[PDB]
Structure formats: C-alpha cells, structure tokens
C-alpha cells in the first residue's frame, strides 16, 4: 500500500531535481523516479526492525566477572581472592553494545538485566556444587561489601537477587539517570579543575552490582563466572553521531590506541578499478 | 528578488550580511527557545539579558594555508571572554544558550577548496596517549583561539588527527551532525543556528561544552598562480535565547 | 493450582525475547523527559543523510585525501573513478550508510550517490556518472558505461549532482555482506567532455562523493558488525 517508486516517463524539463547544492548541509530527497524512468513498486515494508526500540533493545553481554567459592580463612581483603566482586554498571566495557549506543549522544531506556552464572571446578572435585549467587544492586552511597559475608549483604534497602548457578537471573531496572537521558558522550568535567577527569561523568551512572556466592565452601574450589546481559527497553535516542571507527581503549573515553591500523580499506588497484 | 544567497542576520546591535551564501542550517530543525516551565527544575528566576549578550562576537581569524588540518571551537567556551556574555557565564552557576554560528571565508572565482563547517553536540575529545588518559581542562577550554588541529600533541592535550575527528570516528561521517560546506566556488559563508542541546534543562557553562564548532578543510586550498597561499577564516558566533541562573560570585576556572 | 505442562525452551535465555520482568526498583519515579532536539526513532531516518565516501582509498594511511576524487585537465573519454556497489565493503564500509548497513543482513531499495564539484568557479567540466547493473562487468571505455544507467553531469552554478542507483535486482533483497549472487553492480564516473581550468590556475580539482539511501531503502535481520572487535574487556 505504501509506494516505493512511482511511474515516471520521459522528462525534458527545467525543473531539475538531481542538481542541487550540498553546501547547504542538506540531503535532497531525490527519488529514483527523478532521474530514470520508473515503474510503480510498493514497499511491503514498514521499517520495524531498524527502529531504535528494536536496534538497541536486545540483550547484549555487558560484563563477565569471576567469583569463587572457597574457604575464607586468613584471606585479608576477600576481593582480590574473588570471594565477592562488584561491578560498576556500564555499557562501555564490552564494545559491541557500545558501538550501537555511541551512535547517539543521549539515550534513555529502562534496563533489563539477565545475569547468568556458570560453575566450573578446575581441580580435585568429587561433585559439582549446587550454589546460590547473590547479585546485590548497590547504588552510589550504599555501603560496599568488604567481606563476602558482612552486614552489607543483608540488603535491607538495596535490591538483591538470589539465583542458582546454571540458572539465570532476570530483573528490570528503570531509567536511573540523573538527567533526562544518559550521556553517551560528555564534553566536560565534574567541576572546574586543572586535574579532574574528562568525559567520565555520573550522567551515565547506572549503579553497581556486587556478586557473591551465598554458600560457605566445600573441600574443592568452585569458579563461578557471572555474565551480565543488558537489554535496553523503552528506548529514546537523540543526536545521531558518527560511528566509531577505531578500537576503544577505555570505559567512558573516546580514546583510541596509538599506531592503530587504518580503518578505511585500501584498494587493490587505482581509484578507477572495481 | 527572493535571493537565497543574500541574507542578513541581525542580533542585538550586530548585523551580518552575506551575498554568497548557502541556505542556513537550523540544527535538527529546532530553532532556539527559552526553557519552558514544563522542563525546568531549577526554581530560580532566570536572567535573560537579551540585546547585550545575544549578539555577534567575532573571534580571532584563522589563516587557512594549504596544509591546514582544521580548527575546533567549544561553545560556550569560545565566548567566555566576550563582553557581557562572558561575564554572565562566570557570575552564574547555570546557563543555557543557543547559537548562530557564522563562518566566513571569501576568495575569488579562481580559488578552489572546501571547508566542512560542522557543529558536533558534546564532542568529547580523545587523548593522544590512549589508555585511560584524560584531556586536561585548559586544552578542552582554549577560548576564542580554539584548538588548532594542525598543531602538535601536548601533554594532557587532545589528539589532533583530523581524519579521526579527535574522537575515534571518521571524518566523512561528520555529515550526520548539522553542517555546511564553504565550497569556494559556491558560497563564502556558512550559517548554522544551534539550539540548546543537552540532557539537562540548564547547565554549568564552565565545566561543560555543549557543542563544538569544527571548521575542517576537506578539499585543500588551491590558490591561483601569483596569489598568496592563504585565506583568512573568520568565525562569528552569536548567543541566542540565552538564560542565566544562579547568580553568585565570579567563578575561578584554571588558567 | 492450575495444571500446567512445561514446554521445550523453558529456562532458556533467548537474548531477543521481549517479555516482562520484575522491577528491582519498585515505586521509582524516573527523571522527567525534557525536550532534547534531534530525536531518532528509526535508523532509516539517518541513513538518508549523505556522508562522504572515502573513494580515493589508494593510500597506506587514512587521511582527508581518501575522500578527494581527483580530476585532471587534459583528459578526454577517460575514467574518473570506479567502484563495485558492495555497500558493506570497500569504499562504502566506513560510511554512515555502510556502517548501519553492516548491522543488518539484507538490504533493498535505491542508493543516493552525490558528487560535489570543488574546483574554481571559472572552471568547467562535464562528467558522466554510470551505474552498471549486475550480470555485466565493470565498464572499461565510457561506451560500455553509458549503455547502463547514467547521468551526464554538467558542472555549473550548482556544484552537486545527485545520482540514484536504482534498485535493479531480480531478488527482492541483497546481502550486505559481499555475495556474488546478489552483487549490486558497478559505479563509475567518466570524462564526458573534459575538465577545463581557467587561466592562472593549474593542477587537480577534486570531487567529493556522498552516499545515502533513498526513502525506499530496506534493512532487515539484525546482526553483529565486523567493524568493531575486542580482545580484553575495557576498564575505567
């Protein structure tokens, strides 16, 4: 029902749609019917998959971490031993979702998290342990865990989720930005200072997730990998940007490595070759 | 009669005429507007100092010489020393502004060359060292002079490769941002009207740059034989619909 | 208790499912939507914007000269450029069209190809921009080129030609990955008369090539891009 091309015959005219001036900064919406003779075709196509709700709205792996279940006797900090592990939530650590999101400078979405835990015993196990993971959403200002079993994991006001390893978690988080959107990019600082960090802002702060195994320990050591999957939903995006050409180097920075390979592919031949 | 290449822009007591122009760009088709009550969170009554700040401020002229990589300005930063607008920018905690950016480069009918004049909302710059290295405040805030993309890398400064747009994205893809061309056979001016583009309704004008103006030579400047191999590029920026909020003492920025 | 039977795929996490889930923050009231300019609803909006093609990708490094198609003065009948129309590869791979195309498997519809002339206003040229549809080779003598879809471009006060590459395909969709069955054909520019420069000017003048999509453009079956890659996870 939507027309793709219209029927157009031979034109011999002074109204020339295909000569324009791109110094104006505009793309003139020149049809194929404007410079060849066309037939009536129909679209049969709405465009529902290139919508930004569908584009940014499928689950991407955003974080992979290790926690362990072992005997915590004499371990000092319990964080280097990976008895727990917290993660400052961002969509910039793993670059596939990042290049999709850095196509805009402002994005606002409800978040959906799917947290998968897989276990592995790399040595000396008589059985596979049936473990429970606590994933505690820790907003900034909440007490961070220092032990795998301290008072912070009571989570009286922190949202927390328990799930078995091998099983997965799923919970949604609303848009928790301070601003009306998240800043994918921030040409600025937190304050006027000669040494403060550039670009890193709390305008894309989304909280933090602390992860521990609720089980005590066995004889053997269990390595539990936790994979966080983020699906954006109710996506609103603003200011389309140039796509990232160069490899990323850091979270929250537009930096690229020195001496990097050329991103434009060189031809085999001249500019005349096909 | 209705000449699309002859325009006049009057803002305040300042007027720019052009006779060799393209059509002006209004970024994302939004004209600048004041902050409405439905979007406002700050409860202060804002000051709207209309003719004294919403007027053209001509920057220092850049010389385009055949090997010029480009220039980058930061708004509101390139107007931080400009009249009453610069003073309200440092005496207030909050401020929002749209802009009419007008970039000027005249030549003859014998000259060739093309300038990408592009406005990039929140052009977060890349450090030239890579890693987690930050760009220092004084390099992201160079004022009227702007960033010369033909200059060398400095310690704490941004990367100045014009092909990667100082941010890791290719040069040809800047045309998704609201842009014009000063192609010397066609126009000598580029006019871009910028609205206030931010995820907050009003913002600090000293810690944050809303947009960047990049004037980038795409096709190199070819002068005719016997001409000086140099064209001046003059950038004239006017604030538009400028609010200021949260009046206190004058803030002290670095340098 | 309702008797239920549990089907295959129970407990699976398909990453493209769109279901409901419990909110970790009950009664949370998010920040209001203020008006931000430039709102994007659909990626078919922004690929209709023209972006520069790095069509002179004949250099060992990426620079501004990759975007500059050189013209030369005393040249009759010759070729200006040539390219195949695999829009997810080659000169198109890094353009905004070609980057969003690489998030999708199939494409359809017409391409908008622009050339901006940049030489002096007292210069002149006539060029012929040819689209060769598939099944034939890339044209080699301008006589082979004007047998296909072509625009003769007289260069004057309007510095930009807009050529369409019309959708010349038997199959309804083409792969964005280069596939030989579903190749789009070839694009080439040729000297239609020549480039005449004015006195006291010499050398090469340049063309700027642009690519965008016509409004009949289609994209489907979202997939990952081969553009960006990663070895270790990034940190702050």
């Amino acid at each position: 029902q939507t027309v793709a091309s219209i029927s157009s015959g031979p034109k011999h005219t002074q109204k020339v749609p295909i000569l324009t001036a791109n110094e104006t900064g505009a793309t003139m919406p020149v049809l194929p019917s404007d410079s060849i003779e066309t037939r009536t075709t129909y679209m049969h196509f709405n465009g529902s998959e290139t919508d930004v709700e569908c584009f940014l709205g499928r689950a991407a792996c955003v974080h992979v971490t290790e926690i362990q279940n072992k005997d915590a006797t004499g371990i000092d900090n319990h964080r280097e031993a990976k008895l727990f592990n917290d993660w400052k939530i961002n969509l910039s650590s793993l670059v596939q979702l990042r290049k999709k999101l850095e196509l805009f400078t402002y994005v606002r979405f409800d978040s959906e998290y799917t947290i998968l835990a897989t276990a592995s015993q790399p040595d000396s196990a008589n059985y596979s342990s049936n473990l429970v993971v606590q994933a505690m959403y820790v907003p900034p200002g909440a007490p961070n865990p220092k032990e795998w079993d301290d008072y912070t994991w009571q989570s009286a006001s922190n949202p927390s989720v328990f799930f078995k390893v091998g099983d997965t978690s799923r919970f949604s988080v609303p848009y928790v930005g301070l601003a009306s959107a998240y800043n994918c990019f921030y040409d600025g600082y937190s304050h006027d200072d000669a040494e403060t960090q550039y670009g890193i802002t709390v305008l894309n702060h989304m909280g933090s997730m602390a992860f521990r195994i609720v089980n005590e320990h066995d004889e053997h050591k269990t390595l539990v990998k936790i994979r966080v999957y983020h699906r954006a939903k109710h996506v609103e995006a603003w200011i389309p940007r140039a796509p990232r050409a160069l490899p990323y180097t850091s979270i929250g920075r537009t930096n690229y490595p020195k001496n990097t390979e050329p991103v434009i592919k060189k031809r085999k031949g001249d500019i005349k070759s096909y | 009669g209705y000449s699309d290449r002859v325009q006049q822009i009057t803002l305040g007591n300042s007027t720019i005429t052009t006779q060799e122009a393209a059509n002006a760009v209004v970024c994302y088709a939004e004209w600048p507007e004041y902050l409405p009550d439905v979007d406002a969170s700050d409860v202060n009554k804002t000051s709207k100092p209309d003719t004294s700040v919403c007027r053209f401020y001509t920057l220092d002229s850049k010389t385009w010489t055949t090997g010029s990589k480009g220039w980058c300005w930061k708004l509101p930063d390139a107007l931080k020393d400009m009249g009453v607008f610069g003073q309200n920018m440092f005496f207030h905690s909050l401020g929002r502004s749209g802009y009419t950016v007008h970039v000027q480069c005249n030549a003859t009918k014998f000259h060739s060359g093309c300038l990408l004049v592009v406005v990039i909302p929140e052009h977060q710059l890349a450090s030239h060292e890579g890693g987690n290295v930050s760009v220092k405040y004084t390099f992201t805030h160079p004022g009227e002079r702007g960033i010369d993309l033909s200059s060398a890398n400095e310690v704490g400064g941004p990367v100045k490769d014009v092909i990667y747009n100082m941010n890791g994205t290719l040069l040809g893809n800047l045309l998704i941002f609201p842009h014009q061309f000063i192609n010397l056979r066609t126009n000598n001016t580029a006019t871009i009207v910028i609205p206030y583009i931010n995820s907050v309704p009003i913002d600090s004008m000293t810690r944050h740059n809303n947009v960047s103006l990049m004037v980038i030579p795409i096709a190199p400047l070819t002068v005719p034989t016997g001409a000086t191999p140099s064209l001046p590029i003059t950038v004239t920026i006017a604030p538009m619909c400028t609010e200021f909020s949260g009046i206190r003492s004058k803030s002290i920025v670095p340098q | 208790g309702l008797p239920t039977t549990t089907l295959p795929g129970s407990g699976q996490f398909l990453t493209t499912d769109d279901r409901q889930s419990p909110s970790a923050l009950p009664n949370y009231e998010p920040t209001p939507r203020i008006h931000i300019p430039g709102k994007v609803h659909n990626l078919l909006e922004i690929i209709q914007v023209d972006t520069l093609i790095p069509m002179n990708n004949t250099h060992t490094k990426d620079e501004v000269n990759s975007y500059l198609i050189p013209l030369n003065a005393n040249r009759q009948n010759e070729q200006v450029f040539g390219t195949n129309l695999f829009i997810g590869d080659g000169v198109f791979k890094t353009t905004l069209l070609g980057e969003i195309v690489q998030y999708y498997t199939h494409w359809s519809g017409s391409l908008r190809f622009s050339l901006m002339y940049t030489g002096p206003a007292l210069s002149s040229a006539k060029l012929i921009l040819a689209y060769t549809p598939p099944g034939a080779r890339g044209p080699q003598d301008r006589r082979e080129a004007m047998l296909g879809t072509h625009v003769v471009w007289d260069i004057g006060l309007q510095s930009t030609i807009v050529m369409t590459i019309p959708w010349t395909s038997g199959v309804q969709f083409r792969y964005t990955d280069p596939d030989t069955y579903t190749s789009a054909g070839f694009l080439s520019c040729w000297y239609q008369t020549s480039l005449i420069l004015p006195p006291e000017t010499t050398g090469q003048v340049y063309l700027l090539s642009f690519i965008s999509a016509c409004p009949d453009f289609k994209l489907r079956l979202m997939k990952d891009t081969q553009t960006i890659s990663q070895t270790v996870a990034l940190t702050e």
């Epitope: - | 034989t225 | 250099h59 009759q76």
Partner: antibody, heavy 116, light 107 residues
Framework: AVQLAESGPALVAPSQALSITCTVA????????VAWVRQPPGAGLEWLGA???????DYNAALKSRASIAKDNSKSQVFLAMASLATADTAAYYC??????????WGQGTTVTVSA | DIVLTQSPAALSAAAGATVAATCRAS??????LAWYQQKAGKSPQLLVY???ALAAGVPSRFSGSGSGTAYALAINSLAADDFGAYYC?????????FGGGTKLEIK
Amino acid sequence: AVQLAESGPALVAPSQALSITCTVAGFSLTAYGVAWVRQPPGAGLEWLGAIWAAGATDYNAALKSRASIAKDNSKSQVFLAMASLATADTAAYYCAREWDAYGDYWGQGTTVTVSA
Amino acid sequence: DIVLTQSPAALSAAAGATVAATCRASGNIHNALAWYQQKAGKSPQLLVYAAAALAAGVPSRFSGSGSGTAYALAINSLAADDFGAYYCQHFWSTPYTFGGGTKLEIK
C-alpha cells in the same frame, strides 16, 4: 604480468626523425596512460611526455615543438616520435604506465644514440 | 611550470646509517609527488608515491614525508640494496618535471 617493451632504432643520424615504440602487455591502452622519460648517461631523468588513457597528450615544455606521442590501442603500441635530433637526445628512452597518475612499470629502455 | 629542486647532489654514507634526501618545489604539489630509485644500469623504480606512501614491495625502511612544497625522503637503517641515484618527480599539473637527482656512494 604488466610489461612495457621499448623498441627503437638505437642509432640515428642527427637532423632526422626518431621513432620509439612501447609494446604493451598485461593491460590495455584505453584504460591506462603511458609516460615517456629519458635519461642521458650521467645526467638525471627528464620527463618527455605522456599520452593519456584516451588520446590526449601532454608534453615536456621545452620539447613540445619537436616531440609527439601517439598510440594504437588495437595493436597495444605507443609511438614516441621526435624530430630534429640534437646530440642531447642521446639517452635511454623509457616508457611507463599510469599508476594512480604516477609513473610506474618502467621498461628496460632503449639506448638511442644520435651520432654521425 | 613547476621546477623541482632536489638536494643534495650526492651523499656518501655507509650501511646502517640514516639518509635524508630533500626535494623542494617552486609551486604547491599537494602531495602529488613520487620518489624513484635507480641502481646502475637499471630502470627507475618507484619507491614512494603520493609523497608518503610506499609502493608495492618497497621495504619498510624507506619513508616519505613532507607536504606543500618541501618533500623529504628518509631512509632509516640504510642497507646494501639502497645505493644508487634517487629522483623526485611531481605528478601535479603536467609537465611532470623531475628533480636534479641524488647519488649515494658507499663510504
């Protein structure tokens, strides 16, 4: 394999007409230009001229009124012709192929000595 | 017409050393400049086209640099293969004039 074979008389009296052929293999003259460059022994390279990929010729600004370049597309041959030979024309005459508009794929050349 | 000034006429050097030949131009070449090497009794061989980009099979110790009117061919860690006359030619705006040439003698 791109090959350009120069073929001349290699010994010619002065005040005569010179003629070098550049036999072309591996490409067509309709698609690539051919440049001519000489080198007298000891002295450096001098660009003689170029015939472009369709017929149009550009010449050395000193030698334009005596040099002439033609070609034959169907025979894949390029014809450098020189008139009124001086003893400064004693050189190794090379032919090239247009390579991104630069000169490349140089032949072995022909030593052409102008003497009596 | 553009006249290329190539400097110097000769440099006597040894292997491992670093050699820079410089080509100046009367007019702006816009990087449309080529570098040729030539061994004794051989055809000239294009090393660096477009004033910075190495040609096919040219080893990675040659490096062209410069823009505008000043162009410099630098050799980092010169080897035994790298001896002979070197030439600069511009390919901006026919006539495509050469430089004067630069010899390299074994020290």
